[PDB]
């Protein structure tokens with residue numbers, strides 16, 4: 255009861271009231287609340303199409319499937335990301351081409367993308383990491399020059415702006431509504447795209463391949479089941495209404511960590527030089543034993559003993575058994591250095607000033 | 622619309638809302654203790670060893686077949702007379718569905734039809750427990766055993782179904798659905814029961830990113846790529862309430878179904894036949910066959926006229942092999958009992974919040990439209 259986790263959702267009477275309305279309606283799976291959430295994300299991003307899905311992982315699965323990616327194709331991706339993207343690429347039969355990230359913001363650079371392009375490349379998947387945007391214009395420019403789509407992993411970037419627009423204003427991006435995300439419906443995701451044909455395929459492939467060949471709907475080609483229930487969509491709508499205030503509070507907390515950890519050896523990520531608004535999904539520090547007098551793993555342990563949770567976002571995929579053995583030649587020095595040294599300290603909007611003080615005090619004590 | 626009688630509606634009330642409140646207050650909203658409790662509850666319900674909650678029965682099928690190693694070059698025997706999810710999952714693993722016909726009066730596959738379709742390439746048999754009645758699973762299983770072929774049961778319709786005095790899935794492997802129209806619901810969700818330890822271990826990893834502990838105790842990592850089909854605790858809590866309600870809900874469904882059986886006996890509409898083997902019917906759907914020669918009206922027109930009278934109906938199911946992808950990929954498939962029924966069935970309103978007057982309304986309209 256005194257434990258301070260690294261994240262907790264902000265669920266209250268508004269969420270319970272939205273659930274009451276869905277239960278009372280009798281329409282609990284995909285329905286009007288899905289449609290409302292999708293319209294809301296078009297209004298948020300300014301992009302044309304929004305497709306709600308059961309998870310961002312499922313969203314990535316069907317987006318890559320709808321693009322036709324399969325055996326013989328390469329997909330450029332960081333290793334420094336969640337394993338879902340790599341797994342989906344593999345489970346479509348395609349080959350992930352893992353590239354290194356910037357050592358201080360953990361995001362892929364246009365130069366590293368261009369160097370990895372081959373005649374087999376069929377997609378590039380940058381990650382907007384921790385709530386900051388990647389330099390998406392420059393990455394998009396590389397893709398355009400070679401005719402390669404860019405699919406943005408925007409799980410961390412609900413409320414992120416880049417050069418004055420919300421992430422995903424154009425192109426294709428995938429958001430997550432998992433429990434630790436800045437807006438949550440326990441599990442859920444949503445794809446935005448400006449590509450009409452892609453949006454039509456995705457919508458079918460997330461609901462059994464059903465489509466019209468006006469004849470009744472039937473399986474046009476096999477698809478998966480990744481639709482989002484209206485129970486969950488209703489929660490997501492409440493949490494999107496809260497997102498601006500939630501991100502404001504996250505930014506206040508993150509600002510205080512940046513300031514009060516500046517005279518500690520723990521090293522936050524660097525803020526990108528391009529114009530942006532950070533959503534502050536995670537507050538990551540690097541723990542370099544030679545600088546801090548403590549290792550990353552030991553810091554996490556001792557914080558836990560003090561009642562303070564931490565997360566590891568992420569253990570680089572290429573270091574994990576399946577990828578380590580399948581892709582033994584992959585050597586990504588910035589990724590490997592950071593992967594061994596990062597952790598996420600508590601950041602969520604229901605944190606009080608005293609919770610933040612407890613974290614800062616503990617880090618000063620352990621340095 | 623306020624007077625519309627749909628063919629199904631969930632029974633959501635204060636108990637469900639109080640379960641949701643508890644989960645939200647706890648702050649643990651995705652997979653957690655409610656999942657574990659739901660799984661334990663399904664082991665106690667069925668008597669089987671392992672229970673794995675998933676985000677849908679479709680995802681359950683996907684990961685179950687995947688964990689069995691089903692892939693290119695393997696044949697999977699399945700009815701066409703079922704939901705398209707099973708056929709789609711077979712295909713999307715690269716395997717080949719072998720569609721067989723069903724009994725003309727209960728719409729379930731027979732042991733004879735299974736045996737006739739077995740080849741050296743067959744790697745699974747997927748019977749469907751249809752509308753709330755069980756298939757003759759001992760006989761189907763015996764065919765599987767004789768040839769060394771696993772039987773994976775589609776039990777989406779069979780929460781509360783008994784066979785020979787035990788709940789469906791008491792042994793073997795079976796997959797339940799908690800979709801909105803199923804007898805217990807958490808809007809979307811499912812659950813796998815299995816008696817196979819290794820299969821259960823593989824499934825648990827493949828529905829959550831392939832994560833596992835490597836042999837030779839380290840932290841979790843990707844052992845082999847997996848999917849994301851875990852069930853949130855918000856949903857698991859709803860399912861727990863609906864399972865607590867399932868005995869009473871199924872009793873009410875049986876009362877309605879018995880009344881339909883009796884009061885449609887003097888109409889030309891033809892319910893499914895009740896299997897001869899011993900069972901307890903869950904009464905997920907009340908299906909009628911509408912043959913224009915006998916009834917004076919076609920299935921499609923009956924559904925349209927009922928809708929005009931404020932009465933909803935469903936079509937469970939348009940046989941998979943008649944749908945574009947399968948008709949064009951598998952044009953050679955010819956399944957006379959399936960094709961005859963698929964063109965003639967519909968599901969009339971059956972859900973436990975129906976009142977006696979709702980049931981009278983349906984019976985009266987069917988009598989009018991004969």
Ligand SMILES: *Cc1c(COP(=O)(O)O)cnc(C)c1O
Pocket residue numbers: 309310311312335336338339381407409410429430431432442443849
């Ligand atoms: C968790 C995560 C995903 C997958 O999201 P789900 O909603 O859990 O499927 C994808 N990308 C990143 C960066 C993530 O953190």
Ligand SMILES: *Cc1c(COP(=O)(O)O)cnc(C)c1O
Pocket residue numbers: 479677678679680703704706707749775777778797798799800809810811
């Ligand atoms: C409900 C249904 C399914 C799939 O169920 P979901 O939980 O919606 O994925 C599979 N088989 C049958 C026979 C069904 O009725």
